[PDB]
Each structure stands twice: as C-alpha cells, then as structure tokens.
Design a protein around this nucleic acid. Structure first.
Lengths: 132, 213, 99, 129, 71, 82, 218, 82, 22
RNA sequence: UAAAGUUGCUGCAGUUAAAAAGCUCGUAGUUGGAUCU
RNA sequence: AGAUACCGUCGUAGUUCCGACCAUAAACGAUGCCGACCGGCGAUGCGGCGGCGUUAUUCCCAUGACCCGCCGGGCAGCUUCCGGGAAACCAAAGUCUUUGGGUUCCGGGGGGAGUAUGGUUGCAAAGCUGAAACUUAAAGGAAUUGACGGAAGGGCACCACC
C-alpha cells in the first residue's frame, strides 16, 4: 500500500532531470532542497517526493535509469564507452574460411590471402530441425 | 564505387569482413536478397557476396554524404547489438541517434516530445527496426538498412547485404559506413588507416564488462 | 458468416468422412471433426502407487499404463473444458497448448 | 481452351504494366499481335520488341515503357463503319486528346485516326491509351 | 458469364425476353391478370353508387377513423 | 500542358518515378527523392554533385526500391558492373 | 501569430517556398493549415456539406457526436474535403475546415476538344471510389457546366472545373462516401499519365535541401 | 523482380526450367552410343528408352525401361552425342 | 417456424387434398 | 418515358444480401491455336 | 404444473445382402467448366531428374529407408498495401466506369409460395415444370457499440466467505 502516484513520480523525475547537482542521498537533505527549489503546497507531498527522489538516487548509482535522462549521464556514458582494446578482436593471425567462401574470395581477387585457413565443410547435411 | 580504384575494396577490409563473419548470412533467403548472395553452403548457410556488400556500402555512404546538414540523417537501432555502434556513428559523423526503443509517432506526430523530421534514415535491422521504417513511408523518408539474407526489403531504399545478427558484424558495418562517409566528406584521408578501430563500435555483454572490471 | 476457413473440420480433398461415436454422449461426429484425445495414464493412481508397489511380489515391476482414445463431439468437448472458446484472432492458432 | 490470342497478349501486357515490369513475354505470337504491337509502338506506347522464333509459333518479348494505362481487346470483332467510329471513340477512349482504337481494315491494321484519314471502316480489334 | 459472340443475337434477345418476365412491373403490365382484376378496368376514374359509409381504422402506429364509402 | 496558342496552362508538372515512369502524386507520402553524392575520380571525395532518383511509394511497398535504386545507380556509373 | 512547428512550416513562413506547387511537387505532407492560409487564404471558400449525428450505445444512454463534412477550395485549381467528428457542432465544423485545408490537392484541368483559351474541364475520364460509391468524371464541351448531383457539383465547382459530365453508382445517398469518391476522382486528375506528360522529369532541389542552411541558421 | 531480362536467360536458369517453359523448348533427353566389351559394334540408345534393347552382336540386355531414364546395364560404356 | 416443419405441414395438406380429390 | 447500371448489347448480379443445376456425358446452338507477299 | 419430449427398460418397420423403384440432401468450397496473366515462403502426396553423406540387402553398382535441391500436376497452409470487396474476407471472390477471352445454368424488394393449377414421371411417398389474386415498407447482408446469457476465463469485497 506504498505505491507512489504519478504526481510524486513525475515531480521527482523532473527534479532529478533538472537539478541533479544540488540533491544528494539523505532524505532529510533532499526534502530541504526540494522545498527550496519547488512550490510544494503540502509537507506530506514534499516528504513523498523527496523519498522517491532518494530512492531514485539509490537507483542511479547502480546504473542509468530508464526514465531518467540528463546530458550529464549521456557524457558520462560516452566516457564509459570510450573503451578500446589493445588488440582488435577482429584481425588475427589465422581465420577459418570455408571452401565456398574461398571460391567467392578468389572471384574477388582476394583469394590469395595467406591469413585464410581452408577449413573443411560440415561432414553431413543435417541442418533442419525435425518437423512435427 | 564506379570502377574508381580509389574506391575499390582493400585486403584489410576483406580480412575485417571475414573475421567479423559479415559474409555469413542465415539459413533463410528473402527473394529480394537473391542478387546479393554468392552461394549456399553445405550446412544451409548463405554466403554474402562481399563485393556487392562494398558496392551497397559505398552507395549508402554517397547517399549520406549528399545531406549537407549531418543531423538530418537519423541512425536507428532497437537491438542492443547495434546501439553502441549507432551512437559511435552519430558521434563521428554528426548524425542524430535513436538508440533503444523507437517511439511510434516520432516522425508523424508533430506534438510529441521526440518529434523530428530527418532527411535520411539508417537502421540496423529492418525486421527489428520495422517501426521507424513504416513511419518513413509517411514523411517521404529515404531509408538505408543493414540487411541479412532473410531481411524484408519493404520500405528499404538502399539495402546493405551483411550479417546483422552478430555484434562484431554490426559494429564493423557501422564503423565502415562511418569511415566511408568521412572519407567522402573530406575529413580523414583514404591513404592511412583510420585512427579509430571497429572494436569501439562493438557491443559487449554486461558479463563482458564485468569481466573487464 | 463463416467462422472458420476449414469449417471446424479437416475435410479437404474428399467428399465424405466416416463418422465415430462420441465417448461421452455417443453422438455421431465425423472423425475429422471430432476432438481426439490420447490419454496415457498410469493404471493406478498416484495415491495407490505406494501401497501397490509396496505389496508387489516383484522388485521394480513398473506398473502398466492405460492408453485410452477419446473422441469428443463439439458440445461435449466444450462442456468438459477440453477445448474452450477463443478470440477471433486467437481462433486461428493451431499449436497445441504447451502443457 | 485458348481463343483470341490477341486478348491473351493484351492482357499479359496490361498486367505487366500494372506490375511496373520493364518487359513482358507474349506467347503464342501472331500476325495480328505483331501488327497491333507495331501500331502501339509508332505512337510510343510500348517501345521495341523482339520475336523469338520457336518452330511452332512465335513468342514476343516486349520492352515496356511505363506510358501505357490500358490496352484492351474488343471481342467479338465488331465491324465498324466510319459513322460509328465516333461512338466507339466516346465509349472506349478516356479523352479526345489521346488514346487510339485499333481496327483491321482492308488497308491493314491501324488506329482510328488513320482509318478516318484513309476513309475506311473495318473490324475493331481493341484499344490502347 | 454472358455470351459475347457475333452470332449470339438470338440467344441474347431470347434471354432478355424471358428474364423480363421476372420483373414485377413488366409482368404486371404484360399478363392481363392485373388488368382484369383492376376494379377500374384500366381507367383513371370510375363512377359508382355509394352503398354505405364506413369508418376504417388507421394502421397500428396511428389512431384515427378514416371516413370512407363503399361504392 | 500546351494549348493551341502554345502557352503552358498546367499548374505544375508532376515528377515521375525513375523506376516505373509513373507519375508520383501530390499526396504520395511514401515516395522519396534521394540524392547520391558524386565523387571525384582521382581523390574519391564529394565534388558537390549528385544524382537524383525519385521512387514512388508503390515500388517502395513492393520492396523493389532497393533493386530500382541499385539499377539506376549502375546505369549512372555509380555502381561497378557486376 | 503563426509559430511554425515543422520544417515546411518554417520555410513557408520565412517566404522560402514561393507557391503551393513546390510543396506538391515533392509530395510533402502539409500538417499546418497556416501554410494553406499563407498560400491560398485569400480565395478559399468553405462550405459545410453535411452535419451528421452519429451515436455510440452505452450503459445509460447513447453518446451523440456530430460529424461535419466540409468542402473547401478557391474556385480555381484547388479543392479539399474534411470530415471531423466532435461532441459540438461548431467544434466539428472548425475541425472539418482545418482538415479540408490540410487535404487540399491540385486539380488538373484540360480541354474537351480544341484548346482555345484556359482549361475548362477534366483532362480525361477519371474515377474515384469510396465504399461502393463510384464517381466518374468525363470531359465536357465548353459551356455545358457541371452535369452532376449537388454533392459532387459543389466539389467540382470549388475545384475550378467549369464543365464536366458525371456518373455515379452505388449508395450515393451516404453523402460522406459520395464526397470522398468525387474527391478521389478530382485528385486523380494530376496522377494520370497523359502523352503530354511523357517528357522526362527534370529533377530540382527539394525545399528541405535547397533551404537546409536557412533551417539550420534560423 | 521488375527488371528480369526475358530475352537472355542465364543458361543455369533455363536448364532449371521445365522443358516446355523455356524460351525455346528443348528436350532433356539425349542419344548415346553404347558399347559392350562382349560386342564388336556400338549401338544408339535413347536416354529414355521404353523397350529392352539387346546387343547387336550378342543376346544381352542393354538397357531396361524405367519411369524416366532407362537403366543401362553395368559394364557398358555409354557416351552422349551432340 | 422451422422451414422443414412448414414443408411437412404443406405435404400433409397436399395428402389431405389428394384424399379430397380422388 | 427518363430517372432504372432496379432487365444491364453498351452495362448488372449469383461465397455469406435473391441466386451455380448433386454430378458428369452428350446433339443442335455459341466459340474455336500458329502459319501462305 | 402439464411432456403426447429430453432420461431409462423393452421393442415393430427399418438398419444387412440380392433384384426392381425413388432421384432427393446445409448433395456445401453455400463459390459452374475451359484458357491466359498476376507476389513470396515453408511443408505434404505421386512421378521424374541431380547430388555430399548415413543405413539394409554379409562386400561393387542397381535398388530400398533417410538427407539436400530442381521440375511437373495435386490436397492444402502461412504471409503480403497484387488487386478486389459493403465488409467478413478472397492469390481469387484479382486482372471491372481504364467496364468485351469462350460458354452453360441462374437471380430481379419481402410475403402469398415452391403454394394453387395444368402437364409429365412414380406402385406409392413424391420428383420436375410452376402462377395469380391479395398483402406489405421494408425483409435482409457484413461490421460496430451496448445490454443480456441456465458461455468460458480472470479480479474484488466481513453490506461475500473461510
């Protein structure tokens, strides 16, 4: 019986989406900053909004939230995804290639590449799942 | 390309394709993707003619370049396998990304918050990106798609024939498209290899990042 | 108006299908229209299995099963909840319930 | 069975043009079909076509330029006098500015305008516009 | 479908002539039973002698007594 | 277009599909007009020129916009033979 | 004061588009009626074809809405039809006028016989269809006027068609289907490929491409 | 689709077709010179022979009629003509 | 009324009439 | 008489609104592949 | 309540076969037949063709059983903004005011009525053909929203229960 109405959720989302810098993790400070930067006509409504704001702060620390979107998160995530390995996972010494794709490459005049190892095709022709 | 040897396909590009499994399609073939397939394997897998892949990638890059406002190109990915690739493409090339769920009415509902009017649309998979594609049919939107052998070609104007199932292949195709578009624009040269590499565009499972941390 | 493309039966490519008697009411129903159940149930219940296996003169006798073929008519099959009404879209579905 | 090979030819052309195809195969061919296609071509409606010679009856590969709205046959081949030509034009043609009724006359197979120019009636084979 | 042949004039005309008899107005105006059963005998007016005054009750939705006469 | 006097009396001249030549309508919102950047033959860079292809919504619905655009580009020298 | 919401609206407001025909040439969807007011909003006349009360059965009564069918168009070369349903008749008419403005299409006019003067009739026989209602427009000689039912006559007059023969089949008593079928027939006039349109199309720069810099910088 | 060249079909596609639906119909059958080691002369056998052919210089079966192509007895060398 | 029972009534009427007109 | 394309040759319908004979065969009738300067 | 029914025990004709009649069914795909064109896909039946590989006839080919394709007819299915349609829906019910491939049957608001009457067929029952007077503003099709159901499935409540 403690589900939050869309008023509280939406107000918390807007406050978090605009004023991320000011708020923290302690409910007794989120309530004060919220009542400072917002017109909340009731103490109980302010308490509910600040509690959900504290819950949202506990939610974001473990990862980006679906309903929360600010530019700071976008830049932080682009910093996070600024990861490049030492060796490319693509190009290695030996890559297996089937005889048919080997013929396709020799048609393209790239069939003389030495990185290619001509593997043998499947022994049989069992690739359809049984019907029924 | 147009038989322009400066635009011809390189040995390194072929090796990248073969390593990412780009040439490897599925076991089913849409009748409109027949012209892009070389031959079926002994295990029912269709091999994608990478010459046609390069031709269609260059055609798509040419279409992208002929939009002098780069933000008027919209790059869409609903699957996680192409979200990071789409974001990297948008960052490098200046396009507008939609990574995640595409809200219906984005192209059609003028009142919506995410309403936009792109001039060209690029998607990772026509099957998984069917919603923007359909909306493309409402606002005169040309469409580029990375199409597998069984991809449906409805509302797809430039279909790039490539494996779009594996993360490696999707990332490599988006990286190659960004490289080609930049090379045609003028920024970055066609002589030395691009300083960025495909693994930036790839997608890593959350378990992979946990392993890397 | 037509409710089903197959008319609630499988009489494609023939003119007459031999009838069968409903196991419940003995109604005559075409063999391709009747709803067919094949119940393979243990001949003893899951309650009596313990006493029967304890009292067996053999060790690991494995009790035999019971293979019954039931041919319900549409009225009886609906009343017995073996099949039920479906939405106009869901009617077309032909995969059996997962069970 | 098959009757009025011209009807089948024109139906194939019409259905291929509706589908947006650049070529259509017509089989079997005939002198009437070739003459009708030539009358069509002189007005720029279908463009060039090729007659494949198989040793029983010809086939025709007709290149299609998407200028054709409807090609149709008039069965039976009603005999048309010069007086009734205006009524046939009103019935079959979309406008007085374009569209041709093809007739077989003793002077050959030709459109209605050429029939009026040569002052001859004939039997109506079909129309195209 | 219908017969479209240069020698089908007789069949078409015969079919039209038989099918006209399935039109109620044509059959009424071309059988004679309606003309013979018409009290006026095909006339527009007729003179008669009033036999009595009657009050006919209106149909069910309405309620009135329409004054008529037996002539 | 032309009257007897020769002046043009149309409101406008609608464009035709580059694939089927059929007229693209005023309310055919599934039709596209796509530009393909032309490239300098030696540097391989955008020279400011492009080829314009208009495809009606019917062809795009049929899934033949890909083939039609590929064929239009091939005939323009954009796409290599074979 | 009109504040554009779309790129086309911004281009029209900033006097980048010089006529409705450039918008029509590229089949762009017009989503703001202020564009139509800008380009034709000195000659457009509206006319309410019908007010139709429709009802939805509910638990405690029938909910009644009114559908306004409104035809619009300057009586030269442009016509639109709008159908809007609302709980209020005035609101329905306002919405129908907006929708008719949004659906205005160019009307191609041609000649019946010889080509002296301005076009006066349809270029050819056209047919529009809407729910079993088939409306055929046939070119007519100059001075004959519109030979039609009143409902298609209103739209044909607002389209600028001086004279035209018509045929109707189906349930034309349903004014909405009749109006939509004749609107389809009218709009098919410019989609018809006549031999005077066989000349190859000379592609031009689209409004979004030819004024992309203006859109970026404004 | 929408641009298939019907005048110049590829030989593989034309061989895939039914023998009557080809551009110009051609049979799938052929004639073979067949030669038996126990014979000093060759004979001509239809690929789809409906009768039991015997060796010209012997009394041995040469091919047995089947549903389609005839079954040539083993040990006999057969070469197609034309 | 079920149409087949109306047909049955008509047939019984016809039989009664046949008994009427011998 | 037109409206009535509600007699439909032009020009109608026949799965469910009225309607394809239970099913084949079959004479008259109607219709009939390419080809000859 | 009544049951001249539903339920139960019996039970005649019949149900079975032979010969002679009857010729009717929601005899249904409620969809005439012949021909052409028009999307895709995966199955399945028969025949034919081609091919890795597995298995049986102890081992070689043939041939069987599989596997992968192709072709031809066939019973169907899924999908599709082919197109059509009032829609339901239909790859035919598409190629239809841009209306004409050939041909047969057949309909013309609802009732009266598939009735009366005549003819014909049958041993009969009945079959085929088949009206009119009179009456009537609607009958009807598809779909939508409600309301209802001695329809199903979910959810809630000490003015429900445990």
């Amino acid at each position: 019986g403690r589900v939050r109405t869309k008023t509280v959720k939406k107000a918390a989302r807007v406050i978090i989406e605009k004023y991320y810098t000011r708020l923290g993790n302690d409910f007794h400070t989120n309530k004060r900053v919220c009542e400072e930067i917002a017109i909340i006509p009731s103490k109980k409504l302010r308490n509910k909004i600040a509690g959900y704001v504290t819950h949202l702060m506990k939610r974001i620390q473990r990862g980006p939230v679906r309903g929360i979107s600010i530019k700071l998160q976008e830049e932080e995530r682009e910093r996070r995804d600024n990861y490049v390995p030492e060796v490319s996972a693509l190009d290695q010494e030996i890559i297996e290639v089937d005889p048919d794709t080997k013929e396709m490459l020799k048609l393209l005049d790239f069939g003389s590449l030495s990185n290619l190892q001509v593997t043998q095709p499947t022994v049989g022709m069992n690739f359809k799942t049984p019907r029924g | 390309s147009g038989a322009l040897d400066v635009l011809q396909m390189k040995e390194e590009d072929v090796l990248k394709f073969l390593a990412a499994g780009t040439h490897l399609g599925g076991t089913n073939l849409d009748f409109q993707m027949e012209q892009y397939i070389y031959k079926r394997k002994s295990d029912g897998i269709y091999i994608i003619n990478l010459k046609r892949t390069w031709e269609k990638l260059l055609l798509a890059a040419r279409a992208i370049v002929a939009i002098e406002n780069p933000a008027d190109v919209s790059v869409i990915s609903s699957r996680n396998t192409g979200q990071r690739a789409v974001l990297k493409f948008a960052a490098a090339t200046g396009a507008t990304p939609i990574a995640g769920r595409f809200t219906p009415g984005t192209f059609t509902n003028q009142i919506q918050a995410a309403f936009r009017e792109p001039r060209l649309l690029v998607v990772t998979d026509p099957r998984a990106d069917h919603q923007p594609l359909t909306e493309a049919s409402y606002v005169n939107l040309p469409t580029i798609a990375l199409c597998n052998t069984d991809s449906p070609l409805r509302y797809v104007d430039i279909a790039i024939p490539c494996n779009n199932k594996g993360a490696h292949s999707v990332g490599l195709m988006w990286w190659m498209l960004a490289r080609e578009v930049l090379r045609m624009r003028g920024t970055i040269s066609r002589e030395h290899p691009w300083e960025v590499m495909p693994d930036l565009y790839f997608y890593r499972d959350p378990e992979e990042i946990e392993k890397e941390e | 108006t037509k409710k089903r493309r197959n008319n609630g039966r499988a009489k494609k490519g023939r003119g007459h299908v031999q009838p069968i008697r409903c196991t419940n009411c003995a109604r005559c129903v075409p063999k391709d229209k009747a709803i067919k159940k094949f119940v393979i149930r243990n001949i003893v219940e899951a309650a009596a299995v313990r006493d029967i296996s304890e009292a067996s003169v053999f060790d690991a006798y494995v009790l035999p099963k019971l293979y019954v073929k039931l041919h319900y008519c549409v009225s009886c099959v609906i009343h017995s909840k073996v099949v039920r009404n479906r939405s106009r879209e869901a009617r077309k579905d032909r995969t059996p319930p997962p069970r | 069975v098959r009757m009025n090979v011209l009807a089948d030819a024109l139906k194939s052309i019409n259905n291929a043009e509706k589908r947006g195809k650049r070529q259509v195969l017509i089989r079997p061919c005939s002198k009437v079909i070739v003459r009708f296609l030539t009358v069509m071509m002189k007005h720029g409606y279908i463009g060039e076509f090729e007659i494949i010679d198989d040793h029983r009856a010809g086939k025709i590969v007709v290149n299609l330029t998407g200028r054709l709205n409807k090609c149709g046959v008039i069965s039976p081949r009603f005999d048309v006098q010069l007086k009734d030509l205006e009524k046939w034009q009103n019935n079959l043609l979309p406008s007085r500015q374009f569209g041709f009724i093809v007739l077989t006359t003793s002077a050959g197979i030709m459109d209605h305008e050429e029939a009026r120019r040569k002052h001859t009636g004939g039997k109506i084979l079909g129309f195209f516009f | 479908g219908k017969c479209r042949g240069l020698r089908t004039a007789r069949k078409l005309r015969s079919h039209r002539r038989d099918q006209k008899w399935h039109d109620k107005q044509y059959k009424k105006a071309h059988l004679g039973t309606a003309l013979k059963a018409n009290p006026f005998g095909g006339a527009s007016h007729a003179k008669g002698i009033v036999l009595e005054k009657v009050g006919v009750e209106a149909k069910q939705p309405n309620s009135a007594i329409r004054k008529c006469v037996r002539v | 277009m032309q009257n007897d006097a020769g002046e043009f009396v149309d409101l406008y001249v609608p464009r035709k599909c580059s694939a089927s030549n059929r007229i693209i309508g005023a309310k055919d919102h599934a039709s596209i007009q796509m530009n393909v950047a032309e490239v300098d033959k030696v540097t391989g860079r955008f020279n400011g020129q492009f080829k314009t292809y208009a495809i009606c919504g019917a062809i795009r619905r049929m899934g033949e916009s890909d083939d039609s655009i590929l064929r239009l580009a091939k005939a323009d020298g954009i796409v290599s033979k074979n | 004061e009109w504040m554009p919401v779309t790129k086309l609206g911004r281009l029209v407001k900033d006097m980048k588009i010089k006529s409705l025909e450039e918008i029509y040439l590229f089949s762009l969807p017009i989503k703001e009626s202020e564009i139509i007011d800008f380009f034709l909003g000195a000659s457009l006349k509206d006319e309410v074809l019908k007010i139709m009360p429709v009802q939805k059965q509910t638990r405690a009564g029938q909910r009644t809405r009114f559908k306004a069918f409104v035809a619009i168009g300057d009586y030269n070369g442009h016509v639109g039809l709008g159908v809007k349903c609302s709980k209020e008749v005035a609101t329905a008419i306002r919405g129908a006028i907006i929708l008719a403005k949004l659906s205005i299409v160019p009307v191609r006019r041609g000649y019946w016989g010889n080509k002296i003067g301005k076009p006066h009739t349809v270029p050819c026989k056209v047919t529009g269809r809407c729910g079993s209602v088939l409306v055929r427009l046939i070119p007519a000689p100059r001075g004959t006027g519109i030979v039609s039912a009143p409902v298609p006559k209103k739209l044909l007059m607002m389209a600028g068609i001086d004279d035209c023969y018509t045929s109707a089949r189906g349930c034309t008593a349903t004014l909405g289907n009749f109006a939509k079928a004749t609107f389809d027939a009218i709009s098919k006039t410019y989609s018809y490929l006549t031999p005077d349109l066989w000349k190859e199309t000379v592609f031009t720069k689209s409004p979004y491409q030819e004024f992309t810099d203006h859109l970026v910088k404004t | 689709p929408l641009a298939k060249d019907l005048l110049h079909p590829s030989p593989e596609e034309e061989k895939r077709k039914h023998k009557k639906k080809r551009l110009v119909q051609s049979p799938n059958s052929y004639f073979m010179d067949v030669k038996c080691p126990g014979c000093y002369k060759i004979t001509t056998v239809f690929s789809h022979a409906q009768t039991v052919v015997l060796c010209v210089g012997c009394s041995t079966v040469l091919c047995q009629p089947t549903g389609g192509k005839a079954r040539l007895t083993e040990g006999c060398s057969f070469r197609r003509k034309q | 009324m079920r149409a087949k029972w109306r047909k049955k009534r008509m047939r019984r009427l016809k039989r009664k009439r046949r008994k009427m007109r011998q």
